[PDB]
A paper describes a structure:
In the [name]-KD-ATP complex structure, Y169 and E170–M172 formed a deep cavity to clamp the adenine group of ATP and a magnesium ion bond with the catalytic base D237 and the β- and γ-phosphates of the nucleotide. Other residues, including G99–G101, K124, Q132, S176, K179, K221, and S223, may contribute to the stabilization of the nucleotide through hydrogen bonding. The catalytic spine is completed by the adenine base of ATP, which binds to the V103 (from the beginning of the β2-strand), A122 (from the conserved Ala-Xxx-Lys of the β3-strand), and L226 (from the middle of the C-lobe β2-strand). We also analyzed the [name]-KD activation loopresidues that mediated the kinase functions. This activation loop contains three phosphorylation sites, namely, T250, S253, and T254, as indicated by the electron density. The [name] kinase domain adopted an active conformation with a salt-bridge formed between K124 and E140, similar to the active conformation of other kinase proteins, such as IRAK-4, BAK1, and BRI1. In addition, we determined the location of the DFG-Phe residue and calculated its distance from two conserved residues (K124 and L144, labeled as D2 and D1, respectively) in the N-terminal domain, revealing that it belongs to the DFGin group. By analyzing the Ramachandran region annotation (A, B, L, and E) for the X, D, and F residues of the [name] X-DFG motif and the DFG-Phe χ1 rotamer, we found that the [name]-KD structure was in the BLAminus cluster. Furthermore, the regulatory spine (R-spine), which determines the positioning of the protein substrates so that catalysis occurs, was assembled in the [name]-KD structure. The R-spine contained residues from the activation segment and the αC-helix, which assembled by the L155 (from the beginning of the β4-strand), L144 (from the C-terminal end of the αC-helix), F238 (from the activation segment conserved DFG motif), along with H/YRD-Tyr217 of the catalytic loop.
We identified [name], a member of the RLCK VII subfamily, by a screen for sugarcane orthologs of Arabidopsis RIPK and rice GUDK. Thus, [name] is a member of the RLCK VII subfamily localized in the plasma membrane. Furthermore, bacterial growth was measured to determine the bacterial proliferation inside plants, showing that transgenic plants exhibited significantly higher bacterial proliferation than that in wild-type plants at 3 days. These results suggest that [name] plays role in regulating drought tolerance and disease defense in Arabidopsis. Like the typical structure of protein kinases, [name]-KD contains a small N-lobe, composed of five β-sheets and an α-helix, and a large C-lobe, composed of six helices, an activation loop, and a catalytic loop.
Numbering used by the authors: 2 to 39, 45 to 111, 117 to 140, 142 to 174, 177 to 227, 233 to 300
The structure:
Amino acid sequence: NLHVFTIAELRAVTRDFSMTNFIGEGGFGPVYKGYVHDLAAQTVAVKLLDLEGGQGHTEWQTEVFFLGQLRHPHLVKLIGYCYEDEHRLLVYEFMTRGSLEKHLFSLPWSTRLKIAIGAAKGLAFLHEAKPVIYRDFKTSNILLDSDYKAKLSDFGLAKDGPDETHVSTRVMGTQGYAAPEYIMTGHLTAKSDVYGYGVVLLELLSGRKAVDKEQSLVEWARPYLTDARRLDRVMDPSLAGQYSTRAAHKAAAVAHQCVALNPKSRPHMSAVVDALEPLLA
Ligand SMILES: Nc1ncnc2c1ncn2[C@@H]1O[C@H](COP(=O)(O)OP(=O)(O)OP(=O)(O)O)[C@@H](O)[C@H]1O
Ligand SMILES: [Mg+2]
C-alpha cells in the first residue's frame, strides 16, 4: 500500500529540499523533485506542509485517505507519506510536465482535447465510485506526463458524497472555479465539481484565465458558446485552423452546459466523456 517515510529519508530523497529541486507550491506548501533508490526506483514529488500557512493536518489526512484507496489511470499516484512530530509530507509519482496552468498561462488543439478528456475520465471515476466529490477542481490541479496525459492531483479538499441530496461543509476552494450555488449556500454536490470542470474546459478553449482583474471568463464568454457562428470571439487565436467548426462548437456547448448556474442542468461527467472523446478522432 502506502510507504511510510521519515524526515531523514525525504531529506536524502530531495537533496535536503534544495531550491534546484523546487517544482511548485500551493496553500499546503512547496513541492520538491526527489529520487528514490533501490518500491521501484523513480522520480517522485515531495509536498511539505507549511506550518504557518492556512492548511494543515486535515488536508494531509484527506489526501492519504482518498489517494491511498483511489486507483485509476487519470488520478495521480500517492507513493507514501511522512508524519513525524509537527511535520507532514506527501510523496507522489513525479508528473514530468507539471501542472496545466503553467502550460496554458502553444498547446495544440488535439493536446487540449486529450487533456480535457483525461481530466473528465478522472472526475467521472470519482463521481461513479462510495462516490467522492473532488471540490477543488481547477487548472493547476491537472498534472501532465510526457505524453500530456492528464491526471487529477491534490485531494486536500476531497469529500465523501451524500438518501441525502447534498453535503454541508465550509466554503472552500478557489475563486472562479468553485461552483456558485456552493459558494452561496455551503451545500456541496458532485454537480459542483462539474462547474469547475466547465471552467477549465473554457480555459483550454480560449487560452484565458477563469479570473483576470470581462474579468470573469464564464460571465463574459457565457452567451457566446451556444452559436457556432460566434466561435471566433471565444476560441484562443493561437488555435486557428487546427479545429473544425463542429469540434470546437461541441466542446464549447459542453462547456456551456457544465457552467450552468442551475446545478440540475449540468451533465454527468460520464456524458461529458462521451461528448468529447469523438472530437479527438
Ligand atoms: N506529482 C507532481 N509532479 C510534478 N509536479 C507537482 C506534483 N505535485 C505537485 N506539483 C507541483 O506543485 C504544485 C503544488 O502542488 P499541490 O497542488 O499538490 O499543492 P497544494 O498546496 O495542495 O495546492 P492548493 O493550494 O490547491 O491546496 C502543483 O500545482 C504542481 O505544479
Ligand atoms: Mg491542496
